Design a protein around this ligand. Sequence first.
Ligand SMILES: *[C@@H]1O[C@H](CO)[C@@H](O[C@@H]2O[C@H](CO)[C@@H](O[C@@H]3O[C@H](CO[C@H]4O[C@H](CO[C@H]5O[C@H](CO)[C@@H](O)[C@H](O)[C@@H]5O)[C@@H](O)[C@H](O[C@H]5O[C@H](CO)[C@@H](O)[C@H](O)[C@@H]5O)[C@@H]4O)[C@@H](O)[C@H](O[C@H]4O[C@H](CO)[C@@H](O)[C@H](O)[C@@H]4O[C@H]4O[C@H](CO)[C@@H](O)[C@H](O)[C@@H]4O)[C@@H]3O)[C@H](O)[C@H]2NC(C)=O)[C@H](O)[C@H]1NC(C)=O
Ligand SMILES: *[C@@H]1O[C@H](CO)[C@@H](O[C@@H]2O[C@H](CO)[C@@H](O)[C@H](O)[C@H]2NC(C)=O)[C@H](O)[C@H]1NC(C)=O
Ligand SMILES: Nc1nc2c(ncn2[C@@H]2O[C@H](COP(=O)(O)OP(=O)(O)O)[C@@H](O)[C@H]2O)c(=O)[nH]1
Ligand SMILES: Nc1nc2c(ncn2[C@@H]2O[C@H](COP(=O)(O)OP(=O)(O)O)[C@@H](O)[C@H]2O)c(=O)[nH]1
Ligand SMILES: CO[C@H]1O[C@H](CO)[C@@H](O)[C@H](O)[C@@H]1O
Ligand SMILES: CO[C@H]1O[C@H](CO)[C@@H](O)[C@H](O)[C@@H]1O
Ligand SMILES: [Cl-]
Ligand SMILES: [Cl-]
Ligand SMILES: [Cl-]
Ligand SMILES: [Cl-]
Ligand SMILES: [Mn+2]
Ligand SMILES: [Mn+2]
Lengths: 335, 335
Amino acid sequence: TKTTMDYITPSFKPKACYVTLVRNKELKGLLSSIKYVENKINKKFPYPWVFLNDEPFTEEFKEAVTKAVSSEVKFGILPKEHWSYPEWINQTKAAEIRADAATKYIYGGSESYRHMCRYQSGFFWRHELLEEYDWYWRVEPDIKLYCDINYDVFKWMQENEKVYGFTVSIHEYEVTIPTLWQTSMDFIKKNPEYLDENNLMSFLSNDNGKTYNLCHFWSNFEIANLNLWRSPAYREYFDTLDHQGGFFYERWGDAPVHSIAAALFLPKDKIHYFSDIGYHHPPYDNCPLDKEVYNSNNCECDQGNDFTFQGYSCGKEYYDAQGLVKPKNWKKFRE
Amino acid sequence: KTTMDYITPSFGKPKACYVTLVRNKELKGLLSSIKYVENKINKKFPYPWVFLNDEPFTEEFKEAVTKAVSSEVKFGILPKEHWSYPEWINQTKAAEIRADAATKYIYGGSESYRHMCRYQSGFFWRHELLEEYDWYWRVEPDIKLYCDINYDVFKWMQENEKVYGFTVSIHEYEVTIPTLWQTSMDFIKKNPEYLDENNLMSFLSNDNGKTYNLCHFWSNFEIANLNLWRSPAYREYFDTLDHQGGFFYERWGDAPVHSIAAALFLPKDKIHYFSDIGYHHPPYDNCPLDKEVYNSNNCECDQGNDFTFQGYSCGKEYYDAQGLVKPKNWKKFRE
Ligand SMILES: *[C@@H]1O[C@H](CO)[C@@H](O[C@@H]2O[C@H](CO)[C@@H](O[C@@H]3O[C@H](CO[C@H]4O[C@H](CO[C@H]5O[C@H](CO)[C@@H](O)[C@H](O)[C@@H]5O)[C@@H](O)[C@H](O[C@H]5O[C@H](CO)[C@@H](O)[C@H](O)[C@@H]5O)[C@@H]4O)[C@@H](O)[C@H](O[C@H]4O[C@H](CO)[C@@H](O)[C@H](O)[C@@H]4O[C@H]4O[C@H](CO)[C@@H](O)[C@H](O)[C@@H]4O)[C@@H]3O)[C@H](O)[C@H]2NC(C)=O)[C@H](O)[C@H]1NC(C)=O
Ligand SMILES: *[C@@H]1O[C@H](CO)[C@@H](O[C@@H]2O[C@H](CO)[C@@H](O)[C@H](O)[C@H]2NC(C)=O)[C@H](O)[C@H]1NC(C)=O
Ligand SMILES: Nc1nc2c(ncn2[C@@H]2O[C@H](COP(=O)(O)OP(=O)(O)O)[C@@H](O)[C@H]2O)c(=O)[nH]1
Ligand SMILES: Nc1nc2c(ncn2[C@@H]2O[C@H](COP(=O)(O)OP(=O)(O)O)[C@@H](O)[C@H]2O)c(=O)[nH]1
Ligand SMILES: CO[C@H]1O[C@H](CO)[C@@H](O)[C@H](O)[C@@H]1O
Ligand SMILES: CO[C@H]1O[C@H](CO)[C@@H](O)[C@H](O)[C@@H]1O
Ligand SMILES: [Cl-]
Ligand SMILES: [Cl-]
Ligand SMILES: [Cl-]
Ligand SMILES: [Cl-]
Ligand SMILES: [Mn+2]
Ligand SMILES: [Mn+2]
């Protein structure tokens, strides 16, 4: 029997790319993100940058982006089948759901946000432009890279045999994923072979699977191996969630979907937290706490606003599940 | 003598200041905010800047801030009675609430955050350093002013007799304010004289006051008349909230508190929405939708991410309560 890791070890310069799903109307915020990535790592360790959109990019947009990125840029449009209601979804039901949740939770009434979530969950890793790569680094507009990155991150992932890399983790607003967990546990019950014997269940749960603690990796920042999403386990998992309906009948985000899959389908030493990469995605920061890393890489963030060990973050849950020794002053963040 | 009677007298250059409560460890984020205020308006219309901290500011902090600001700067420490548990609060109980909520909502387990909320609610406006002023402009670190502001906002508020000025509005997480509305409604039943007959109740409630829709103005951005907070109505209202205990047994923010008071205690035409001031406090923007204002003031935000009319924002509610004509494309933001 070929296992999930059999689909990944083969890929252990790496074939990697930055990948960005973005709207034309977000040009100023994207250009900003690009300037950070350029200055902190891309001019030193260049990798192609793929930009995707559910609509065609404007010439003004492509012209601006092409000038701002020093490495090769690729622009692609999303196939409509990766951004439209599946045949089995009741659209009237979905519309009433959005109408009702319009003011209930962030993006509650948004139709586009849900297609985006489903896209990031099961289709961005199948886009034509990503076929040739084994790794991607997701980047969004209005992001900051607080520090210089003095090593090739993709190369590091390959050499160290890591599969999923992140910076921020946090507890999800449960009102958006009421049935996500139960749906995922039934999946594992019918497919025990996909549950890695040495997985990270402890990050996701405090009672060994009974319930979800809502913890997940913040997907706006990911540096991972595309073959995880391309494995049989993940494909079957996504298809199950896709038929259940939560992307549209609730508001399932790709972050909790990617995270449950990573934390359950892989040996836990395949997940890696980039404690050394300064990053901000509104409204949270990951600011290197190690003095030497912080100084050497000229980090521009306030260590005191590092979200990692704050109550609502899941940095504590992650360190404990991995067995990592938390930095000595972590408790100060819970004040 | 009613509430307005305490405000009309302040209606020479107006007595005003910027006011910033901040920590020593947030210097970089504060310096960034200062750069924005300086380049967008302070160089043109200088006003003294007040910096407050529950602990003393370091020399490094003061030297860096004095240098960054072009107008006068003033540094102050908070009286301990404006930042400590009242004698009527059960601290063991407050501690249990914090521990239990650590992972339930943002700042749920934070002790310092609650002192901060109580502070912004009932004490910043009576700090000795603000006594001589009639107006204040609250500024937080990690903020952005996206556009030029080519007129003296304080002067403008004064000439037009406005009392409370804001940009972002949003629905509060009810889990942080379960009994706030009931406490506020009993206050008004007990003090009918404080409920202005032309109040903005419809912004706060969809059922004539029976329930709170959770709408409030985002207090990180406030340009307001200090005499409102100094009025008997507000003083008594705060004292009532302070005695109820919500700042500690729940997690009452100053945002919903300031808003309920403004929307109920004043004629609704004393409240003003700065549709022309580009602003960002993570993770939301107020970006001028009016193309001429956007271009004449060289805005740097993406109009496409303006938060004002998104479902979870309260811009629609505010516009409707004020009888303001919503911009032509407002519904696009609800998609
Ligand atoms: C200031 O605030 C504090 C903090 O709230 C107030 O103290 C609290 O006061 C209430 C009411 O007086 C007490 O409630 C009683 O609790 C016991 C159970 O006690 C155990 O569990 C507590 C809860 O544990 C969970 O929650 C906490 C907090 O979130 C977590 O930390 C835990 O992990 C749990 O998740 C726990 O707090 C207690 O801890 C204390 O004691 C232990 C044991 O010695 C120590 O290790 C701890 O360090 C700590 O000191 C404790 O473990 C219940 O049994 C009581 O219910 C009975 O009585 C009621 C009376 O009205 C009745 O309605 C109930 O039905 C029930 O009665 C039943 O059983 C009776 C038994 O004879 C029968 O006679 C009866 O017919 C019926 O069948 C009650 O709920 C809190 O325990 C207490 N908390 C503390 C920390 O002291 C304080 O009062 C406030 N001060 C002021 C001035 O108001
Ligand atoms: C698709 O969703 C719609 C919207 O909820 C469903 O229509 C409602 O069905 C209930 C059940 O009897 C009725 O009481 C409502 O009056 C219907 N409302 C509308 C909008 O017609 C519909 O039943 C669903 N169809 C499927 C595939 O089950
Ligand atoms: N092409 C396209 N990209 C979108 C759309 N909605 C969101 N995105 C992108 O998806 C990512 C997440 O969206 P964002 O609005 O930032 O979501 P948030 O992080 O939850 O606030 C960002 O890269 C966006 O630019 C959409 O309708 N079309
Ligand atoms: N001196 C001091 N300022 C604080 C403290 N907590 C928050 N603040 C300030 O209060 C404002 C609101 O705090 P912030 O963390 O930005 O809250 P948020 O906007 O809800 O994330 C900011 O201007 C902070 O710098 C504290 O414990 N001490
Ligand atoms: C802080 O808000 C962002 O992150 C949470 C947790 O992932 C999402 O639920 C939410 O829609 C936004 O994307
Ligand atoms: C999005 O989060 C921010 O805004 C809400 C609503 O004002 C507050 O409750 C919360 O603590 C933060 O300040
Ligand atoms: Cl469709
Ligand atoms: Cl929304
Ligand atoms: Cl105290
Ligand atoms: Cl928190
Ligand atoms: Mn984003
Ligand atoms: Mn803030």
